[model samples]
Target chain A: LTSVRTYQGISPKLGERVFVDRSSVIIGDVELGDDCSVWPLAVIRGDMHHIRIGARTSVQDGSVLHITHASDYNPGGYPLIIGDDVTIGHQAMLHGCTIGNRVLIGMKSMIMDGAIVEDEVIVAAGATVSPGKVLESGFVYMGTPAKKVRPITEKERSFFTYGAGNYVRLKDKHLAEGYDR
Target chain B: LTSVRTYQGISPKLGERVFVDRSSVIIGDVELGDDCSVWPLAVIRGDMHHIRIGARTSVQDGSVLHITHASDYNPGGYPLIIGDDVTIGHQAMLHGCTIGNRVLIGMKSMIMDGAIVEDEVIVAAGATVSPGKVLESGFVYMGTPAKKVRPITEKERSFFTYGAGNYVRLKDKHLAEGYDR
Candidate 1:
């Protein structure tokens, strides 16, 4: 399958060495930076609003990244924005949220509309960051309506780039196998 | 994209009028019943063990249905089984679970290995049913390590077939659009 698609004449923009799996879908108005990887069956649909991700990010398998549309319930709506070295784990749902650099979004986590995740934060597995919530930097967040669990350790802090780099190498292997076509 | 795939020479088996979306993946030893619908980006991987679903069930968008392989850690492993009129909501993770008829597994919920959901149960959105747990019938379950919140109402009981019928129609429209390539 073609991984990238255009919507209303706007196609997805990808930087150099980006690996989007053939089983994944990246729709219009999405910008993925260099060395980024989107795994199997992940959907990044920027049909209504823009979605921007910086360098060395990984959107893992079965994740969904979408935006909120302009409506009376939410005027101006919200776009999804993520900075460099972000690792979005398996089955994550990132909707119209703003995430900073070096963030680790754990497996099955959900970051809702208008939420802001600062740099170097770790959202634990199965956590839910509610709408408009702001997650402070350098901490671990967990649970539904996610609460700050504790500050991340030095070792955990190092995992951000480590995880992103790991996925980069993994995607490179997939790209070598001609799985990105 | 062609989403139905074979593994170890075993392909997915489907009953009449089953709608497996072009964007979804169903691989190896999976059996889908009549009028069942698997929506966009859902993954039903039965490479390790079998996955079986009954009639008029809907596995919604981005859901993941997987089974556990036989190993020393789990002798004989576990298969995934679902009965009739089951409404598995968007992004749900059902791993080696057993779900009975008229069940509603809510959006983003996780039913882990060896979990058993009885008939007429409503698992609330974002719930986490842990491994080896048995959810009683006719109840509403919610929260992480999901607890029985209350008994389901008559209205909710009606929604099982209603929800399944809704998706049936939705998939019919998509089928008309030739989404099930």
Candidate 2:
């Protein structure tokens, strides 16, 4: 059976493979770089704004990424900017957030509107990023309304890098097949 | 790219218009009737038994329906048996249960194992249904561990029927185009 899924936003270059598992949703103005894998049951709505996904990213099951309406709180653009080689785990909610390169967002986390995550960060499971919070680089954020848990160790960094790279490669492989229906 | 989304066992004649959104997962021995819609980021896993969903039903975003292994405590054949024209709102969770016809499950509600919901029932948002509970027909279930919030009003019943049908129709239209690669 033919799939119904299609790329609505800026289409990636030809031969770029993106695997959107069954039942996912992607809207227009979203820029998904080559080699991105979107797991089943994920929802990405990039209408009225831009959702910029860098190369080699995997958004896992039951996660939601959306852009909030403009408000006095956010005077400028509040796009969802995810840098290259990021791994977002299952059931995460990211709204109008910016995630730096090589970040790992754990399962069931909620990054609220206007949250900025710097490079090399890890957000633990079930954490919540307060609205308009800025997280520095190379640290771990954990707990509800997530605080900096600790400085990430070399071992942690290595594992995250490898994991992110793997998903990026995997996404690239899928993009070759085109987007899922 | 080949989809990694898993579909263990689904009955025949699940319907052409029925859409199982990407990133959503469906497990073994489940039966989805004609013109049903399972939206993005939802998961319905019926393992070791069957889950029957009637025609024109809609399970919306971020919802999950799962069933545990059957045992002597519950003698029913399957974990979940849903009737026709049911509408499950976003982020609801149904685990090991039975729902009546024309039911409405609101967002973020959790229905635990071995529960029985009679016809024309409405479960409100953020409600919880404890395990092994039984609710009669034409009633509203709300609150933590879920209680009878009120009797089902005629207006609500009509609204659910219309809503479910609308989703079914939308899925049908999207499926007609097929997912474009």
lDDT of 1 by residue, A42-127 (tens): 98978668999999999999898978667544789899999999999998989899999999999989998899999999999989
- Chain B TM, per prediction: 0.98, 0.85
Native contact share for candidate 1: 0.25
TM-score of 2: 0.57
DockQ score for model 2:
0.21
- lDDT by residue for model 2 over B1-181, one digit each (tens)? 1211334534323664677754456666677888887765577776666678888888867888888775696565447788889888667788888888888886556788878888888887556889878988888887677888778777776766776766666666545534311
- Candidate DockQ values, in order, are 0.22, 0.21
lDDT of 2 by residue, A28-70 (tens): 5576766677776677766436788987788888787766544
Model 2: CAPRI class:
incorrect
Per-residue accuracy of model 1 over B1-181 as CA lDDT, tens digit each: 5689989999899998999878888999999999999977889999999999999999977999999999999999999999999999778899999999999997788999999999999997688999999999999999888999999988888878877877787678657655576
